[PDB]
Amino acid sequence: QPKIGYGSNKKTKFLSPSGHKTFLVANVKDLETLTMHTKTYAAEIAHNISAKNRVVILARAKALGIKVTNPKGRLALE
Amino acid sequence: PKWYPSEDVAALKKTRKAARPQKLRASLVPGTVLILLAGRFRGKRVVYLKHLEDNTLLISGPFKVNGVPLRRVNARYVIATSTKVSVEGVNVEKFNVEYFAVEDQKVVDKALIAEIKKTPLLKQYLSASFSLKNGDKPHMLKF
Amino acid sequence: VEPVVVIDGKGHLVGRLASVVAKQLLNGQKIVVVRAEELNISGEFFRNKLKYHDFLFRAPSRIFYKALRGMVSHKTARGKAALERLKVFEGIPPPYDKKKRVVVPQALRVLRLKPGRKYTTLGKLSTSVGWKYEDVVAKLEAKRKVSSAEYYAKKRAFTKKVASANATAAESDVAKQLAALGY
Amino acid sequence: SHRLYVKGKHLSYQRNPNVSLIKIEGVATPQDAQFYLGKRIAYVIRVMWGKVTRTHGNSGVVRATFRNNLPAKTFGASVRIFLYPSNI
Amino acid sequence: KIELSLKLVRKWKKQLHDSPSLKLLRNIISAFKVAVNLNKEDYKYAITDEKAFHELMFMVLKDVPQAIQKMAPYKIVKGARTLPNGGNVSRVSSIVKSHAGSLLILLNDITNTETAALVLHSVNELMPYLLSYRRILKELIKSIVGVWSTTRELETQIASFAFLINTTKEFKKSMLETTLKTTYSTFIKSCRKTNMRSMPLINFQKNSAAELFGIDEVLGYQVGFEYIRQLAIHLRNTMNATTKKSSKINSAEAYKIVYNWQFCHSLDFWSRVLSFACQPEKENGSESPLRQLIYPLVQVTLGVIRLIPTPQFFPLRFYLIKSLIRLSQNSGVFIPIYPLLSEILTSTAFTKAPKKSPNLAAFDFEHNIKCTQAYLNTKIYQEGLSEQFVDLLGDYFALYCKNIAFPELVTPVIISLRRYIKTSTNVKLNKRLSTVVEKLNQNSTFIQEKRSDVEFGPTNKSEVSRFLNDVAWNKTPLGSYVAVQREVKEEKARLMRESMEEQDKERETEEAKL
RNA sequence: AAAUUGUUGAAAGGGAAGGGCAUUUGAUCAGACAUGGUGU
RNA sequence: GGAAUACUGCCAGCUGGGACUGAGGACUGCGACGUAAGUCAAGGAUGCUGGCAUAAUGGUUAUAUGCCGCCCGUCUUGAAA
RNA sequence: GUUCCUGCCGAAGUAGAGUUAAGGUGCCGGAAUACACGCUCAUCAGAGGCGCUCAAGCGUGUUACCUAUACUCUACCGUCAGGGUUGAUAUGAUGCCCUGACGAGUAGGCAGGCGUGGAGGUCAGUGACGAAGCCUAGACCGUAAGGUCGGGUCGAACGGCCUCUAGUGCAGAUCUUGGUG
Ligand SMILES: [Mg+2]
Ligand SMILES: [Mg+2]
Ligand SMILES: [Mg+2]
Ligand SMILES: [Mg+2]
Ligand SMILES: [Mg+2]
Ligand SMILES: [Mg+2]
Ligand SMILES: [Mg+2]
Ligand SMILES: [Mg+2]
Ligand SMILES: [Mg+2]
Ligand SMILES: [Mg+2]
Ligand SMILES: [Mg+2]
């Protein structure tokens, strides 16, 4: 039964098993807000982005060195 | 200083844990026969010679008696029997931990055999292996 | 202590024997029950009769199997495995007729049930409820008892031979010297 | 023979899948079981390792903790208990 | 920590071209490792000048292989580049083992053609050391296949595949059992979402991976036969799952599992592979093992086509139908496909009049697999479905356009078609079906007049295969018709591409002013 | 249009289809240290 | 007369075997000892040894074999029943 | 009738270790089928299931043993309280940090989150290289209401965010209608 005692530790809260907090990204400008916080944060491309924009976002993310949580999504399946 | 520190380096707090020499179990004494419970020579009876600084007991078969050479053994993986041999005959100073990183074994074995001869049947004991037969309960068994 | 334990059914109570055997099976021990027709139950004949009826397999072995299955959680994997480990028989079929059979003291009727208290024999119950094989098993049991008497005579001769051999070993030195020295 | 251990049975869980109850042969009393505390347990091909923690009841059953819990289908399965780490 | 200076790189290159030593190679490779790991992670070297970094990248990829070769010159043996036995080779081998995954990171981070070519060439001159490893040779062939799979530039894909051929044909032992696996696994999982943009690229991927299977006659048979069997497993899982009552996984809509582009991509690639290996010239009067896989492939494809006779998936049937037609064209195997087509001619789209007519865009039958539920029961969709169907009949019966058996291959079809034509209500369909009927009868008459002069019976296979070898296939009434129709189709597709290409050009103009 | 009924086709199964449990045999997929440096 | 033992109670008396926890992240404090310098068990674990991968293994899926259950609601124990 | 999730205050919590009350130690089930007394087997014997009768039935004592929302220690999550911190913090002084206490709670009362629309402002937001809607025994996140992504479906526009304004899922009855016996 859910209750507060089950609450997770703050230092480990909102953390993926890769250790990166997921941050939603829509465009290149929003990607660039995560320029140095590559260790703390990983980008996640939004569901409504078109395929043409996703390749640009992936290229810029690779250039910045920011981990993308969902690459090869809508460019590959699963 | 060719790279400025990205993020930051969290220095570890100073540790108040000083290593100290081990306090061995009372039964282990130089010249005490031992039973090895693991490794290549598991279940084989050996002699105890000296305790090394790195907490690895030093043991000889002798290789002459049972074919077990000079070797380092962990103390916890060993049983100590109540029968003893006098180790005064063998000097056992030279070889050390760093040395481990035939003739010496022969020198040790001659002296140790010299003491082994006095006690009856000890050579046969060291030659043969040890194992648990059915109906043997270790907790009663006096080793 | 043995790969397989053969338990005689005679003079035992169904509940206690079944509980002990079920406990052993759950621990992995393989047990086989024989001569279950002469198993015993406390109470009177009518009460056990109507109990087996309000359940209503007619054979005594099947009744014992039900009583034991009541212990084990048969619907689970573990319970099923315990059940294949078990074996039950009326009379001694081969090859267990050539093997000695232990007794469980905890379930013995002589040690458990007080003299002057009514009990019931499972064979009579099974026959009364419609098990039409109590007759054939009895003759096999009589033949088994004749064979067992012959085996007992052979065992008496073997014990005499063992006594002679023990005497022979006595007049040997090495054992005597060993015993005095140690062990 | 080359056996330097006693093969014991795994009875059940503590009732907790983490803790397991082990029945060791020739051990009738807790005092006898006190010897086996701290010894390495090995269920055997694949092997899972563990250790004996503390006694359990007056029958000589002991508690045991493995690195990964037993699959619960091994109740009554044969399990090995070695002599190392020896305290004698 | 040493700092990269334009002096230090210059000195390392200075002594590279004359009398290098293993110390220099480890130093260069460690600097290279830092260079490639700057964004993705102790390191002895620090990089601060773009000139020094670019010079390091240049000299590494273009000359560290040269020095490596000069120290440990390989020797060509039976066409394969093999290192010799010696201590110095082993020391250099560990050095290339310390360069390989920097090359791997570069491979995974390819973004354009020339960088791909440079990395692939430097990797090319380092095969003979990395063939000794399998964490590297696998990831190498896995990465370049990744590049060959994900690049949107046809030149980059050409470079990757040319590398795969050049390296594979040299050695054939360690790689070939992994190249095929990686490529066809690309066609399973890491398949490119289909669109009018990706069609030439995926067609190149298929037409390319087809060649690799054909190189090794036996080993290809070992590989494809396994993977095609994987498809069959899915095929058998969905048939049973739909048919049975079990509520395990999606009894009603299990088609999603098997009616996917990736699966159709599979069955098309296999037809292309067998067609390539079974061509008459490559056959050369010699049986090839891949021909024996024709029967499994045909059984799988036919089992997929019939699993749903619903209008929503008629485009799926058409594509596999074209694949089977290709397979029969190349191998000469007799595939029955008319029973399927005539079996669809009883549907509600081929038979009943259109209900709606919203005047949407024409459906892209070539480059789609599904109707999308808006084109169902529409004038456009019926008119395009029939447009494809008629041309498919034309192709299939154009295969045997010049064979002596064509009359009796035509009779049961003309009778059934006239039965459907006389009973079908849709006027446009009857007009199209009619045309094929009279042209079929016409070619039947043509073959009859040409066969009346024949003295050899049906048993003489040699002469039967010689019938009208002088006459071109397109000169027959069904060829001369359908060939023209093919042009009237081909041009259309061209004008689509030569249109869509411009759209992007126009789109580009906009970002110029943004 | 649902809901409902009927013919035809495919599959499984048994008098119902049917599940859960155990064993058996297989098939198929993922599975880093690209370990920082030195030495001949 | 001489005491011993038993019991109760105290010890800032020694020594052995177990089990769980290793939380904290530059230093600061109370201390202890050190001739002294420094060291430590003193405001939360450090050291030594060995191995460290096509593995350790993990997932999915399919048959055959047998065991149990087997109309539905409620009810029930902890759970089928 | 019930009243999205979580928390809090109050008449008359999560995980590891140990201890323990009430209880229990034939098996399912973890614990002695241990001991020592007095009894009772009655055609009303006598107690979850199977079972039990020199008891596995009673009363009377002894230990040992099993273990819970109970007690102790530690770590963690919440509420509360007391604090530190600016000639500025290496992250919103509504921030960060330190220390401690509590977490059952019926009646009653209060707060914080999730979701649904309306409007204003805003993201030089998103979109045929596929917007919104719906499904998804898939992955990640959150204690949870749920959120994000992937896939499927869908095929033309809509969403995120600050504010004010409306506004969270079920139960059951009288029966009614159509349809089927
Ligand atoms: Mg979505
Ligand atoms: Mg049939
Ligand atoms: Mg202690
Ligand atoms: Mg607790
Ligand atoms: Mg506890
Ligand atoms: Mg701070
Ligand atoms: Mg308070
Ligand atoms: Mg309160
Ligand atoms: Mg708005
Ligand atoms: Mg949803
Ligand atoms: Mg979670």
Swiss-Prot record, chain A:
Subcellular location: Cytoplasm
Gene Ontology CC terms, in alphabetical order: cytoplasm; cytosol; cytosolic large ribosomal subunit
Domain of life of the native organism: Eukaryota
Keyword field contains Phosphoprotein: yes
Assigned keywords, A-Z: Cytoplasm, Phosphoprotein, Ribonucleoprotein, Ribosomal protein
Assigned protein family: Belongs to the eukaryotic ribosomal protein eL32 family.
Assembly information from the UniProt record: Component of the large ribosomal subunit (LSU). Mature yeast ribosomes consist of a small (40S) and a large (60S) subunit. The 40S small subunit contains 1 molecule of ribosomal RNA (18S rRNA) and 33 different proteins (encoded by 57 genes). The large 60S subunit contains 3 rRNA molecules (25S, 5.8S and 5S rRNA) and 46 different proteins (encoded by 81 genes).
Protein name, as recorded: Large ribosomal subunit protein eL32
Residues of the full protein shown: 52 to 129 of 130
From Swiss-Prot, chain B:
Name of the protein in question: Large ribosomal subunit protein eL6A
Positions of transmembrane segments: none
GO molecular function: RNA binding; structural constituent of ribosome
InterPro entries found in the cross-reference section: 60S_ribosomal_eL6 (IPR000915), Rib_uL2_dom2 (IPR014722), Ribosomal_eL6_CS (IPR049633), Ribosomal_eL6_KOW (IPR041997), Translation_prot_SH3-like_sf (IPR008991)
Pfam families on file: Ribosomal_L6e
Coiled-coil boundaries: none
Role: Component of the ribosome, a large ribonucleoprotein complex responsible for the synthesis of proteins in the cell. The small ribosomal subunit (SSU) binds messenger RNAs (mRNAs) and translates the encoded message by selecting cognate aminoacyl-transfer RNA (tRNA) molecules. The large subunit (LSU) contains the ribosomal catalytic site termed the peptidyl transferase center (PTC), which catalyzes the formation of peptide bonds, thereby polymerizing the amino acids delivered by tRNAs into a polypeptide chain.
Any one biological process term the GO annotation gives: ribosomal large subunit assembly
Subcellular location: Cytoplasm
Post-translational modification: N-terminally acetylated by acetyltransferase NatA.
SUPFAM superfamilies: Translation proteins SH3-like domain
Entry superkingdom: Eukaryota
Signal peptide positions (record): none
Alphabetized UniProt keyword annotations: Acetylation, Cytoplasm, Isopeptide bond, Phosphoprotein, Ribonucleoprotein, Ribosomal protein, Ubl conjugation
Positions where Phosphoserine occurs in the chain: 6
Chief localisation class: cytoplasm
Annotated gene: RPL6A
Family: Belongs to the eukaryotic ribosomal protein eL6 family.
GO CC annotation terms, alphabetical: cytosol; cytosolic large ribosomal subunit
Additional free-text comment from the UniProt record: Present with 37100 molecules/cell in log phase SD medium.
Curated annotation (Swiss-Prot), chain C:
GO cellular component terms, semicolon-separated: cytosol; cytosolic large ribosomal subunit; nucleolus; ribosome
Keyword Acetylation: yes
Spans traversing the lipid bilayer: none
Biological processes, Gene Ontology terms: cytoplasmic translation; maturation of LSU-rRNA; negative regulation of translation
Family to which the UniProt record says this protein belongs: Belongs to the universal ribosomal protein uL13 family.
Other notes: Present with 43300 molecules/cell in log phase SD medium.
Quaternary structure, from the entry: Component of the large ribosomal subunit (LSU). Mature yeast ribosomes consist of a small (40S) and a large (60S) subunit. The 40S small subunit contains 1 molecule of ribosomal RNA (18S rRNA) and 33 different proteins (encoded by 57 genes). The large 60S subunit contains 3 rRNA molecules (25S, 5.8S and 5S rRNA) and 46 different proteins (encoded by 81 genes).
Name of the protein this chain belongs to: Large ribosomal subunit protein uL13A
Source species: Saccharomyces cerevisiae (strain ATCC 204508 / S288c) (Baker's yeast)
Curated annotation (Swiss-Prot), chain D:
Cross-link Glycyl lysine isopeptide (Lys-Gly) (interchain with G-Cter in ubiquitin) mapped to chain: 39
Ribonucleoprotein as UniProt keyword: yes
Post-translational modification: N-terminally acetylated by acetyltransferase NatA.
Localization terms from the record: Cytoplasm
GO molecular function, one term: structural constituent of ribosome
GO CC list: cytosol; cytosolic large ribosomal subunit
Biological processes annotated in GO: cytoplasmic translation; ribosomal large subunit assembly; ribosomal large subunit biogenesis; rRNA processing
Keyword field: Acetylation, Cytoplasm, Isopeptide bond, Ribonucleoprotein, Ribosomal protein, Ubl conjugation
Family label: Belongs to the eukaryotic ribosomal protein eL33 family.
Oligomeric form and interacting partners: Component of the large ribosomal subunit (LSU). Mature yeast ribosomes consist of a small (40S) and a large (60S) subunit. The 40S small subunit contains 1 molecule of ribosomal RNA (18S rRNA) and 33 different proteins (encoded by 57 genes). The large 60S subunit contains 3 rRNA molecules (25S, 5.8S and 5S rRNA) and 46 different proteins (encoded by 81 genes).
Additional remark text: There are 2 genes for eL33 in yeast.
Protein name per its UniProtKB record: Large ribosomal subunit protein eL33A
Encoding gene (name): RPL33A
